[PDB]
Symmetry: C2
Subunit: 84 residues, 2 copies
């Protein structure tokens, strides 16, 4: 369970942010509403359940909306696949 | 101990690749000889001890030469710092 590059292609099952806070499901609008990055706005980004994803190829890598009421989003720690 | 972006500015003290192999010192020429990426070729990149670094700002983030005589180099796992 690892990514290549910035992980725009990453479809792994990591669900935890770098602080320990779980991800919010992409389909959920609670605790956090989100007008962007829903499974309907980004249908080919693999926004399934609450997996860490990088739908916009952010320089920071895979992230998610967090269940922390006070923090909207955060990065996840998804390792780089070992070099061949 | 975390980075921003692709980790070109990361100056932490992580020293293990994603497989758990201790990194080789940048100054060292064993177990792997390397004429590029030493403290005396990239003096502004913080190629110190065997700390994971991204001197060229490669998409895959921080890496190092490895102490594994059969693996030249590999990525390290340096987490993005928590989002501000």
């Amino acid at each position: 369970d690892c990514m290549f590059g910035n992980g725009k292609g990453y479809r792994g099952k990591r669900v935890t942010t770098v602080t320990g806070t779980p991800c919010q499901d992409w389909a959920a609008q609670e605790p956090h509403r989100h007008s962007i990055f829903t499974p309907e706005t980004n249908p080919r980004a693999g926004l399934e359940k609450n997996y860490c994803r990088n739908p916009d190829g952010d320089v920071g890598g895979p992230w998610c909306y967090t269940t922390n009421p006070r923090k909207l989003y955060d990065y996840c720690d998804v390792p780089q696949c070992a070099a061949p």
